[PDB]
Amino acid sequence: SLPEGSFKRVKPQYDEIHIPAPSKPVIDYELKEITSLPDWCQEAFPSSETTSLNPIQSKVFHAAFEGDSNMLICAPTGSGKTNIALLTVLKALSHHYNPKTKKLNLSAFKIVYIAPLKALVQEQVREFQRRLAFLGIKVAELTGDSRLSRKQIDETQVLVSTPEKWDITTRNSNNLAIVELVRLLIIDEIHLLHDDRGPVLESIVARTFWASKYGQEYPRIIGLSATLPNYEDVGRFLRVPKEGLFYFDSSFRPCPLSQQFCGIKERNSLKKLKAMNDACYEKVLESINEGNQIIVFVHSRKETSRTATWLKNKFAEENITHKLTKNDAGSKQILKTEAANVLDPSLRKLIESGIGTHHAGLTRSDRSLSEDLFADGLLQVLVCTATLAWGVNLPAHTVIIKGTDVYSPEKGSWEQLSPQDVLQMLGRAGRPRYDTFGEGIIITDQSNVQYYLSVLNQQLPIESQFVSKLVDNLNAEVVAGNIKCRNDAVNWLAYTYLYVRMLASPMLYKVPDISSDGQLKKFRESLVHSALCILKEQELVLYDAENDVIEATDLGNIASSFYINHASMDVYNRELDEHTTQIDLFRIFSMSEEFKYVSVRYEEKRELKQLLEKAPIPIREDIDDPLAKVNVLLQS
Amino acid sequence: LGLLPKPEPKVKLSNMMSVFENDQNITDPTAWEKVVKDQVDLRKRKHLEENERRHEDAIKRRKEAVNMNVEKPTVYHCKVFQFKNLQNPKIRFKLKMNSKELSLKGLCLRIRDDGPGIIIVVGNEKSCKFYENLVMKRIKWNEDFELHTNTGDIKMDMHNNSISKTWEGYLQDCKFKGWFMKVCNDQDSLLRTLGQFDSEHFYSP
RNA sequence: AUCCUUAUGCACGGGAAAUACGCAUAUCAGUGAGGAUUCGUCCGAGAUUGUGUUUUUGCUGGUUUAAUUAUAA
């Protein structure tokens, strides 16, 4: 703690603590060069700028060729991960691909790359194409908007999928040949397990080990993640051999992250918000004089525009010219070409000032435009929601996170910024390629700073949320037919990620059994009981308490196929009726649980009002209710 | 500029009802009574405390106040008295302590017990005068006392015993390093005893 | 060693005023500022001049909802 805070500044509005940049790594190792590779692998790095691998990569690489084993990398994800995955891919290709005969063996190996987001999948795919073009490989996307069919999967070799669509592809019974063919299963951002999509990954993992026992040849599993505690427990979840585990701290990061907080001493929201804006302004003023390109995160998208307006009138009151003093002719040109043409959320004026913003709710084209302009650097300041850290790789020298309380429809309450989101926001930083270090900043209330220091140290385990997704995963598995009884269910649950975590800390995750049942036999079986009661109530699976026999129903099969959540499922069950009509169909569709996170907005409200007058299919609900918004959007 | 802690309202009983500091003005009535009351006694203590800090530290400055040596005064005030009977012990003890706290060069002689004799005190004028007030005024030399003797105490009649000032004045150089009461039985060894300090003439037959 | 006294300083509790207070390289002023009266005397430290604030100094109080993505084709 004491080494972390070096220096603290006290200011009238706020008390700011300035953490120094992390330490540079000790060298016990050799930087591994490219000429050490075999013949075909030397084009793995077609542009070899250093001709030597980064501090993280070399050791993990030679270990990766040396062993064929399940591996885990907890790393800054400083662009180091992309190349490592590429290299393991090339190894599998060489194992199925002869060194002498240069014909690539296409039908032997198959590869899967699990990237949480569609956009990041896209980016990855272009990377894999660039690096793998010399072998003559088809690298194509299996997920979502990708829209690959029954055939192209067979044709392709390397796959880049999102977790959801990969889950649904491997869940289906007919394709199992492809699943067996895949030798190489790469999991990017295994730290996702903390978040509620992570349940899908652990379910996929469980299916890989447990579900294919009739062919029974286990594929190579490579986890790739941001640095996280309880790495050992992660390995015990997967298989991981002790040597495959590589834990690298932030000292191995390309640009050391200078951590900074401002505690806010104010309480009432009207002065508190003003104090935050003042602090942000002060930071921006310190940054831009150094020629620093800056990002300011916020909670909500509506917050972005008003924040940028505040920076325009305030920042401009201070000095107008300095933001663009250079190439003002070309800045006027490019700015008018971009802002004036495609933008229509009254965001053009912000672009024109040269403080822009990016958020969900900005047009797809406008969105790409803002990214590009901020890359060129006519945009000095970029106000953003949480989309960028999660999605896009583009780093920016200074990163400010404004505020604590985010509203989550999960609770229906304002919670604190969750650590897993904070960390990935801090990830985008001073550019590893160009700049030397980053500036992280967190605009926050002082009382919660004590919390953010620790959670920002990344001492927090990847929390297992399997409790919510357990039921649906179990149903899908019964549909596969792999579980005929409670004992089978708990054996599958032994390879489940919550199992490990329970073993580590039973009372944290509410194991009553504790001393009893070291293997948590009765705890596992009790969860299965709990699941199969509600499933049976939803007529998803057949179950009997004392006799214990399991079988899958038609509704359960449907939920498995289209990956409907169990809540959505029972909603359909009751709300659909014999006499239900066209009006009620849209209402039920709206009621689908996947829209629970949807809510009506005040900038949306005028267009909603115009719609619902002329809407052909009537709405029983009203403008204030999100369901009505959903089904009118459906009509549109 | 932020360096120091922002102040906070002092809150008294009278003031307690008013304060809109966020803290349990009503909701916790008594727990709020608490923080207030202990707030006051916090301060009040700190007062007494601080006083004791300067008090003690200055007493250490009293040890240092002794550590300097006397800066012997270049010219010496003096006073001389003549008295029939010193026989009352508590007198003598007074004349021991008081002379001693007051840093008084000099002596006291007399003739055996009954013998009248001389009193000499030398030093700064401030102390010498006080010592005089002590001797002449407060202490009553016609006032009889009951003396401890071998078996017990008996009547000793002082109303004959009489004390009077001879004079007071200045002296070139004090030959007295410290003050001692003593006896020399005759007048001669008594006068001679003065004469070792060359003091014979101070006595008046 | 104890107490009182006096002045000054740090304080603590409490009240009072904020037509009050300042400030000034000003100008003078016990080597008399100023005043009084019973006309004999008595009283004995600030006044002038300019200037600034003065319904005030600092602070603090209440009314005019993140991202993301899943079908069998």
From Swiss-Prot, chain A:
Transmembrane segments: none annotated. Residues 62-246 form the Helicase ATP-binding domain. It is found in: Nucleus. A motif (DEIH box) lies at residues 188-191. GO terms for biological process: mRNA splicing, via spliceosome; spliceosome conformational change to release U4 (or U4atac) and U1 (or U11). Keywords: ATP-binding, Helicase, Hydrolase, mRNA processing, mRNA splicing, Nucleotide-binding, Nucleus, Phosphoprotein, Repeat, Spliceosome. Contains two helicase domains. The N-terminal helicase domain has catalytic activity by itself, contrary to the C-terminal helicase domain that may have a regulatory role and enhance the activity of the first helicase domain. Belongs to the helicase family. SKI2 subfamily. This is Pre-mRNA-splicing helicase BRR2. It comes from Saccharomyces cerevisiae (strain ATCC 204508 / S288c) (Baker's yeast).
Swiss-Prot record, chain B:
Signal peptide: none annotated. It comes from the Eukaryota. Keywords: mRNA processing, mRNA splicing, Nucleus, Spliceosome. It is found in: Nucleus. GO terms for biological process: mRNA splicing, via spliceosome; spliceosomal complex assembly; spliceosomal snRNP assembly. GO terms for cellular component: nucleus; spliceosomal complex; U4 snRNP; U4/U6 snRNP; U4/U6 x U5 tri-snRNP complex. Present with 432 molecules/cell in log phase SD medium. Participates in pre-mRNA splicing. Part of the U4/U5/U6 tri-snRNP complex, one of the building blocks of the spliceosome. Component of the U4/U6-U5 tri-snRNP complex composed of the U4, U6 and U5 snRNAs and at least PRP3, PRP4, PRP6, PRP8, PRP18, PRP31, PRP38, SNU13, SNU23, SNU66, SNU114, SPP381, SMB1, SMD1, SMD2, SMD3, SMX2, SMX3, LSM2, LSM3, LSM4, LSM5, LSM6, LSM7, LSM8, BRR2 and DIB1. This is U4/U6 small nuclear ribonucleoprotein PRP3. The lineage of its organism: Eukaryota, Fungi, Dikarya, Ascomycota, Saccharomycotina. The chain holds residues 262 to 466 of 469 of the full protein.
